[PDB]
Design an enzyme around this catalytic site. Structure first.
Site, mmCIF file in Angstrom:
data_model
loop_
_atom_site.group_PDB
_atom_site.id
_atom_site.type_symbol
_atom_site.label_atom_id
_atom_site.label_comp_id
_atom_site.label_asym_id
_atom_site.label_seq_id
_atom_site.Cartn_x
_atom_site.Cartn_y
_atom_site.Cartn_z
ATOM 1 N N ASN A 1 0.782 -1.380 0.059
ATOM 2 C CA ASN A 1 0.160 0.114 0.120
ATOM 3 C C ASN A 1 0.810 1.168 0.026
ATOM 4 O O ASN A 1 0.302 2.111 -0.632
ATOM 5 C CB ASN A 1 -0.983 -0.004 1.228
ATOM 6 C CG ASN A 1 -1.988 -1.105 1.288
ATOM 7 O OD1 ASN A 1 -2.269 -1.503 0.207
ATOM 8 N ND2 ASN A 1 -2.540 -1.446 2.502
ATOM 9 N N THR B 1 20.428 -13.741 -27.992
ATOM 10 C CA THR B 1 19.074 -13.691 -28.295
ATOM 11 C C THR B 1 18.715 -14.037 -29.811
ATOM 12 O O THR B 1 19.347 -13.316 -30.556
ATOM 13 C CB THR B 1 18.216 -12.571 -27.812
ATOM 14 O OG1 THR B 1 18.530 -12.341 -26.079
ATOM 15 C CG2 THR B 1 16.663 -12.479 -28.100
ATOM 16 N N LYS C 1 16.588 -13.482 -33.149
ATOM 17 C CA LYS C 1 16.217 -12.216 -33.832
ATOM 18 C C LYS C 1 15.799 -12.546 -35.309
ATOM 19 O O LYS C 1 16.446 -13.165 -36.161
ATOM 20 C CB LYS C 1 17.232 -11.245 -33.756
ATOM 21 C CG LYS C 1 17.759 -10.692 -32.402
ATOM 22 C CD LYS C 1 16.653 -9.857 -31.526
ATOM 23 C CE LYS C 1 17.190 -9.679 -30.296
ATOM 24 N NZ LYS C 1 16.198 -9.101 -29.318
ATOM 25 N N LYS D 1 12.824 -10.389 -33.008
ATOM 26 C CA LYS D 1 12.356 -10.713 -31.881
ATOM 27 C C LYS D 1 10.950 -11.755 -32.230
ATOM 28 O O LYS D 1 11.109 -12.869 -31.612
ATOM 29 C CB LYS D 1 11.868 -9.531 -31.218
ATOM 30 C CG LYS D 1 12.745 -8.545 -30.852
ATOM 31 C CD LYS D 1 12.330 -7.289 -30.378
ATOM 32 C CE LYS D 1 11.453 -7.454 -28.940
ATOM 33 N NZ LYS D 1 12.312 -8.138 -27.918
ATOM 34 N N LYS E 1 18.694 -17.911 -26.806
ATOM 35 C CA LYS E 1 17.531 -17.651 -26.265
ATOM 36 C C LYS E 1 16.381 -17.415 -26.927
ATOM 37 O O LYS E 1 16.682 -16.859 -28.204
ATOM 38 C CB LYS E 1 17.666 -16.953 -24.701
ATOM 39 C CG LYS E 1 17.988 -15.373 -25.133
ATOM 40 C CD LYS E 1 17.961 -14.785 -23.890
ATOM 41 C CE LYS E 1 16.965 -14.243 -23.014
ATOM 42 N NZ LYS E 1 15.785 -13.562 -23.755
ATOM 43 N N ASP F 1 13.514 -14.833 -27.454
ATOM 44 C CA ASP F 1 12.953 -13.374 -26.798
ATOM 45 C C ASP F 1 12.136 -13.500 -25.943
ATOM 46 O O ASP F 1 11.129 -14.278 -25.905
ATOM 47 C CB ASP F 1 12.599 -12.576 -28.266
ATOM 48 C CG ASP F 1 13.628 -11.309 -28.284
ATOM 49 O OD1 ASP F 1 14.235 -11.318 -29.414
ATOM 50 O OD2 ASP F 1 13.950 -10.555 -27.391
ATOM 51 N N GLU F 2 11.969 -12.576 -24.855
ATOM 52 C CA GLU F 2 11.094 -12.450 -23.710
ATOM 53 C C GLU F 2 9.647 -12.555 -24.444
ATOM 54 O O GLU F 2 8.687 -13.286 -23.636
ATOM 55 C CB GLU F 2 11.292 -11.218 -22.930
ATOM 56 C CG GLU F 2 10.950 -9.798 -23.482
ATOM 57 C CD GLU F 2 11.981 -9.655 -24.554
ATOM 58 O OE1 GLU F 2 11.309 -9.004 -25.714
ATOM 59 O OE2 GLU F 2 13.026 -9.857 -24.378
ATOM 60 N N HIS G 1 14.295 -13.663 -17.409
ATOM 61 C CA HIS G 1 14.396 -12.388 -18.036
ATOM 62 C C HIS G 1 13.649 -11.578 -17.334
ATOM 63 O O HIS G 1 12.363 -11.748 -16.695
ATOM 64 C CB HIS G 1 13.660 -12.530 -19.410
ATOM 65 C CG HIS G 1 13.772 -11.277 -20.207
ATOM 66 N ND1 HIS G 1 12.849 -10.571 -20.135
ATOM 67 C CD2 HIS G 1 14.472 -11.051 -21.027
ATOM 68 C CE1 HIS G 1 12.968 -9.462 -20.918
ATOM 69 N NE2 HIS G 1 14.074 -9.903 -21.479
ATOM 70 N N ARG G 2 14.081 -10.473 -16.950
ATOM 71 C CA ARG G 2 13.499 -9.405 -16.010
ATOM 72 C C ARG G 2 12.393 -8.510 -16.530
ATOM 73 O O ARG G 2 12.406 -7.324 -16.362
ATOM 74 C CB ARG G 2 14.485 -8.689 -15.408
ATOM 75 C CG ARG G 2 15.400 -7.639 -16.170
ATOM 76 C CD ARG G 2 16.287 -6.651 -15.265
ATOM 77 N NE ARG G 2 17.409 -6.276 -16.138
ATOM 78 C CZ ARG G 2 18.335 -5.585 -15.631
ATOM 79 N NH1 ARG G 2 18.452 -5.234 -14.452
ATOM 80 N NH2 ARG G 2 19.158 -4.906 -16.760
ATOM 81 N N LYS H 1 22.682 -1.124 -24.527
ATOM 82 C CA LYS H 1 21.598 -0.167 -24.978
ATOM 83 C C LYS H 1 20.522 -0.031 -23.813
ATOM 84 O O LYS H 1 19.811 0.931 -24.005
ATOM 85 C CB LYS H 1 20.870 -0.827 -26.178
ATOM 86 C CG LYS H 1 19.894 -1.898 -25.953
ATOM 87 C CD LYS H 1 19.508 -2.686 -27.065
ATOM 88 C CE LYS H 1 18.690 -3.794 -26.807
ATOM 89 N NZ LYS H 1 18.390 -4.745 -27.887
ATOM 90 N N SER I 1 23.138 -8.359 -21.072
ATOM 91 C CA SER I 1 22.479 -8.428 -22.406
ATOM 92 C C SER I 1 22.141 -7.108 -22.814
ATOM 93 O O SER I 1 21.638 -6.042 -21.987
ATOM 94 C CB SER I 1 21.323 -9.432 -22.357
ATOM 95 O OG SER I 1 20.912 -9.830 -23.615
HETATM 96 O O1 LIG Z 1 14.915 -7.994 -26.474
HETATM 97 C C1 LIG Z 1 16.162 -7.646 -26.241
HETATM 98 O O2 LIG Z 1 16.361 -6.380 -26.622
HETATM 99 C C2 LIG Z 1 17.655 -8.198 -25.845
HETATM 100 O O3 LIG Z 1 16.773 -9.597 -26.434
HETATM 101 C C3 LIG Z 1 18.898 -8.034 -26.282
HETATM 102 O O4 LIG Z 1 19.165 -8.097 -27.520
HETATM 103 P P1 LIG Z 1 20.504 -7.916 -28.469
HETATM 104 O O5 LIG Z 1 21.358 -8.761 -27.615
HETATM 105 O O6 LIG Z 1 20.172 -8.197 -29.685
HETATM 106 O O7 LIG Z 1 20.321 -6.511 -27.998
HETATM 107 C C4 LIG Z 1 17.256 -8.731 -24.276
HETATM 108 O O8 LIG Z 1 15.966 -9.360 -24.008
HETATM 109 C C5 LIG Z 1 17.614 -7.291 -23.460
HETATM 110 O O9 LIG Z 1 18.907 -7.091 -23.218
HETATM 111 C C6 LIG Z 1 17.048 -7.473 -22.152
HETATM 112 O O10 LIG Z 1 17.319 -6.349 -21.288
HETATM 113 P P2 LIG Z 1 17.887 -6.629 -19.804
HETATM 114 O O11 LIG Z 1 19.115 -7.352 -20.025
HETATM 115 O O12 LIG Z 1 18.321 -5.005 -19.438
HETATM 116 O O13 LIG Z 1 16.971 -7.081 -18.922
HETATM 117 MG MG LIG Z 2 14.769 -10.126 -25.959
#
Ligand SMILES: O=C(O)[C@@](O)(COP(=O)(O)O)[C@H](O)[C@H](O)COP(=O)(O)O
Ligand SMILES: [Mg+2]
Ligand SMILES: O=C(O)[C@@](O)(COP(=O)(O)O)[C@H](O)[C@H](O)COP(=O)(O)O
Ligand SMILES: [Mg+2]
Lengths: 139, 482, 139, 482
Positions: free
Chosen positions: B125, B175, B177, B179, B203, B205-206, B295-296, B335, B380
């Protein structure tokens, strides 16, 4: 093919002098070195053969190097790595492992596929060296 | 007259009506902390005219037992015992309207092994309270006794490296690509190529879960073929973080079980699944011999600003408690938002057996990790091998360096991309261990340009990307420099 | 029948002098006394009706007795009990409950048997007073 | 010239060979105890010619990381951390060649929530060691951090009294007699009659499980008819401890679930079922809203003698951690061993929220109980209403006083037996609360004679049993007086 286990295997085979320097690093950090041998290059061959005991007491890189070359001269054709081991709390594990020797003609592996349920596949990674000959005469 | 009236409580404290949170026993300037207390450090921006102690006590009280007016029902409990204490308030360096407030909570307030319950009290809260214009949870001291109720990492740094048979250099990933949009077939292609070229991992992508363009079973089966093909070609254990993130917990398990059954070493989850599914799938990962990469996703919605939210360092603690094996913790030079000092502290929290106070790294409390296992940080986002000297220096040994675009973007193909990154890495580590001052602006780039002379893919990656940097001001900075 | 809930209900109905002595004991230990009323004598009727708040800031047994006697005048025929609450870590509960008033005549209960699976009986205890008349007019 | 010989370890500590355990690192008289350490106190009678300290070191070694000869493999672990340190060896009062040895054990030696594992280390092998002629575990300090991994009592005293709706006196029960031979129907009769007459509980005898003379289901159904008849006749919550002790864990749960489904408030288990069956059923009891009564069968096989075994106070600690609601803990005045100071120690251990050092009561360590619920002790075996003054004095309020023969051996019937016990009890507590000096050899028996003038049943039980005592020298006695 080049077996790329170990941590410096995308670099060229290390010289004695380059190995001594890696040993120096590890000894200055308090770690224990050991040397091990195999002629089974399977990625899941966790236990390569011990060459004597790990060298916990030793205060001079030349001792590790001297043992490396004694191992080189006694062991059959295959692979030798040197490992560094950290007994510290919260590590208690290998912290470094790199190949010191590798045979000239590594054929590598083929992927062996057995049909599972549906589309699933049962994979076995098979080594040419190991299937053709027993330990001690594989290279 | 009537019985309700004759039996009214008439004491100063439990007479009906509003009294300030400080006069309700939620403030004590000389409380002595116990080794079993949950401690929380808050950054409190009180509203104009609200007292700094009052707002600290308000936060204590509404995160433990209080409400806005006095209740006789306190007296059915051992209420001295359950009340949290705001016990110290310093002003934040270089500002006279923002305060650091230390608050101590009694151990028994918290459900054993429940991050859901810990957070329900601590962030439930209080961040939306009117008397406070902003509020940020900066750090927490999780006491040994609470920590022993949690699993900690399922596998952890030490056992992970053992299952991988890889010790001595940071681990390596990418990751896949683009995405979104790739078919499972083509996903399995990218994974095979990247792994075969030198990467330990790829991996999902999230946001790759299961979509019209590619359903999850196709991805998993095709990636497994790719993975085992890579390991057959290299004699290394390989993997790819198969994403098991899903709508329901039943679906997450179904995906986890599928990963297990076809032999995957590792699976990923997104943070947006939330803490209860995370804890579930962390127990599951221990019980089924699986690496769990977190993945956060969503973190920076609350984690970015300094005036308000939760500092990522607390998320580190909570996630290491819950038991994820990997967690993204920033790159410094890529980035995504990363101040070197704060990232370093994040990394220490994830990796060390204990923490000693170090205010520059944002480590406000000293803390034992209670032999909970060590969580593997992941670096990453927009990084490349021209930065390898920086990565090694800033992030150390136990870390996974991920290069999604920095591998796949490589003009000579995906295998070329991966190989460039691993040679880069191995030569840099080799050099560090030899004593070379790798972090020097001259030496570091030179170690790689020297390594490039015998690695074609590396020269090309250095040629393509060596200008690239993400030179911007931080939002999440320390309040104490180095 | 005699309702044998409360911790002194195998002794004769307590006098006011005996009640005060138990109140005085409870209050010497630092316990909070309260007074409660019911006309549902069921074993599993946890929540009797509160006669005001528990008397937290009250040091005088005579005041507690006064509320007992006021409860006795104002409440419909039924049962009154006095409890003593201990708020300490380790307890945080009632530590003494006994009956101070009971009806002239308590018909008691019967055991209602519903056939369950096999030989299992599903049991319900039924108060005669309660089934016959609503709260406030059961005795 | 061979690789074995050149790499042979030649240090004082890790060369091959036997060396004294006191040189292996298991004796450190200036070890500072940590709050997270598990402490044990042992009474050691070394063999003639063995140094006391060397014995303490042997015990510390062989219950932690050591064996009889030196092993190089210690050096693969953090060996210094994992060794238990004997940290104190003291002479025992009035035995010339017997010693108290305190030993500290690192928290990480112990599987979380596992009594089996704690006992595997602390009592596994060290009692069969030849170098020690006798060994007894006298007490343990179980640290707060280990205790939180455990459930503690499923119910505990506080919630138990809320389920019974019974506060202000000791609870009351009785074992059904004869121990063996009664059919199902007759068991229910006995139970019905005792409950109707005033007892809160009856219980199956420890060796009543399922047998030719009565199969367990018959007892369970008939007991519930009698229990529910008594509850309806009295308006009280009633129960009987139905024994679910069985050969296999599958059968115990079947009996437990049967007991639940038919509405029993309570089940019992015998200690002979063993620790792992016990923790399972304690968890089950939490999950299924059941009171769990522990009969301590076999306890006295190791707990009786001063020179050797495990003192029952340690067993108290272990069963409270595992999470039984009741444990038999002694009578002082009844037919089974129980010195007054030792009993009061056991009762304190099971009921207090923490423990202060109290050597006359045998409490060698101070210890927080970590808010684990309080375990109800049970006073049973050879007691009668004529000793109620002694029982109220020695044992306090939170206790179940059990009168098997003292109820069923009443010449006027089981109801009369029960009623006599309950009047003695209520009349004794009423008088304590009034200020009467009830424990005086004059006044105690007088409080009972008064009540007997107005309770035929009690008068008759005083006349039958008044001269009955079990006055024998204790074996399990104190080392310190007051
Ligand atoms: O989706 C993306 O942008 C990435 O796949 C990076 O890809 P690249 O390696 O091609 O840039 C990662 O998920 C992020 O870096 C996560 O951020 P953090 O690591 O801050 O959690
Ligand atoms: Mg990603
Ligand atoms: O089997 C028996 O003898 C009892 O039923 C007592 O019955 P009576 O009251 O009829 O003797 C109890 O189990 C003992 O008290 C156990 O000893 P402890 O409580 O010391 O473990
Ligand atoms: Mg018995």
């Amino acid at each position: 093919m080049r077996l790329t286990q170990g941590c410096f295997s995308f670099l060229p085979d290390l010289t004695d002098a380059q190995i001594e320097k890696q040993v120096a690093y590890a000894m200055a950090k308090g770690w224990a070195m050991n040397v091990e041998w195999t002629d089974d290059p399977h990625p899941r061959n966790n236990y390569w053969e011990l060459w004597g005991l790990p060298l916990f007491d030793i205060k001079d890189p030349a001792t590790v190097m001297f043992e490396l070359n004694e191992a080189r001269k006694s062991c059959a054709a295959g692979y030798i790595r040197i490992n560094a081991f950290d007994a510290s709390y919260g590590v208690e594990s290998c912290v470094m492992s790199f190949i010191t020797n590798r045979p000239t003609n590594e054929p590598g592996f083929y992927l062996d596929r057995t049909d599972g349920p549906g589309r699933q596949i049962v994979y076995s990674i098979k080594s040419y060296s190991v299937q053709a000959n027993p330990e001690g005469s594989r290279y | 007259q009537s019985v309700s009236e004759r039996t009214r409580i008439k004491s100063d404290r439990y007479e009906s009506g509003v009294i300030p949170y400080a006069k309700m026993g939620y403030w004590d300037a000389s409380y002595t902390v116990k080794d079993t207390d949950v401690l929380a450090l808050f950054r409190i921006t009180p509203q104009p005219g609200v007292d700094p102690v009052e707002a600290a006590a308000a936060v204590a009280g509404e995160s433990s037992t209080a409400t806005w007016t006095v209740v006789w029902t306190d007296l059915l409990t051992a209420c001295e015992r359950y009340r949290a204490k705001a016990y110290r308030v310093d002003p934040v360096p270089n500002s006279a309207d923002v305060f650091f407030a230390f608050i101590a909570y009694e151990c028994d307030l918290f459900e054993e092994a429940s991050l859901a319950n810990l957070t329900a009290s601590i962030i439930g809260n209080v961040f939306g309270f009117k008397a406070v214009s902003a509020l940020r949870l900066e750090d927490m001291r999780i006491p040994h006794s609470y920590l022993x109720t949690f699993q900690g990492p399922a596998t952890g740094i030490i056992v992970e490296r053992e299952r991988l048979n890889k010790y001595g250099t940071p681990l390596l990933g990418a990751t896949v690509k683009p995405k979104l949009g790739l078919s499972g077939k083509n996903y399995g292609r990218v994974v095979y190529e990247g792994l075969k070229g030198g990467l330990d991992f790829l991996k999902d992508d999230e946001n790759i879960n299961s979509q019209p363009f590619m359903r999850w079973r196709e991805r998993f089966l095709n990636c497994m073929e790719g993975i085992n093909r890579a390991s057959a070609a290299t004699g290394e254990v390989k993997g790819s973080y198969l994403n098991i993130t899903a709508a329901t917990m039943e679906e997450v398990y179904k995906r986890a079980e599928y990963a297990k059954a076809v032999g995957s070493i590792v699976v990923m989850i997104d943070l947006v699944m939330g803490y209860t599914a995370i804890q579930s799938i962390a127990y599951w990962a221990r019980e089924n011999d699986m690496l769990l990469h977190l993945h956060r996703a969503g973190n920076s919605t609350y984690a970015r600003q300094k005036n308000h939210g939760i500092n990522f360092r607390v998320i580190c603690k909570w996630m290491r408690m819950s038991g994820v094996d990997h967690i993204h913790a920033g790159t410094v030079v890529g980035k995504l938002e990363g101040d070197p000092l704060m990232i370093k502290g994040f990394y220490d929290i994830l990796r060390l057996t204990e923490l000693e106070v170090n205010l520059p790294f944002g480590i406000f409390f000293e803390m034992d990790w209670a032999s909970l296992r060590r969580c593997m940080p992941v670096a990453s986002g927009g990084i490349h091998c021209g930065q390898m000297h920086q990565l090694i220096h800033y992030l150390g040994d136990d870390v996974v360096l991920q290069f999604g675009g920095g591998t796949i973007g490589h003009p000579d193909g995906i295998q070329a991309g991966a190989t460039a990154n691993r040679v880069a890495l191995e030569s840099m580590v080799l050099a560090r261990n030899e004593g070379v001052d790798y972090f020097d602006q001259q030496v570091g780039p030179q170690i790689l340009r020297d390594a490039a002379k015998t690695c074609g893919p590396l020269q090309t990656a250095l040629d393509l990307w060596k200008d690239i940097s993400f030179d911007y001001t931080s939002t999440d900075t320390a309040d104490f420099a180095e």
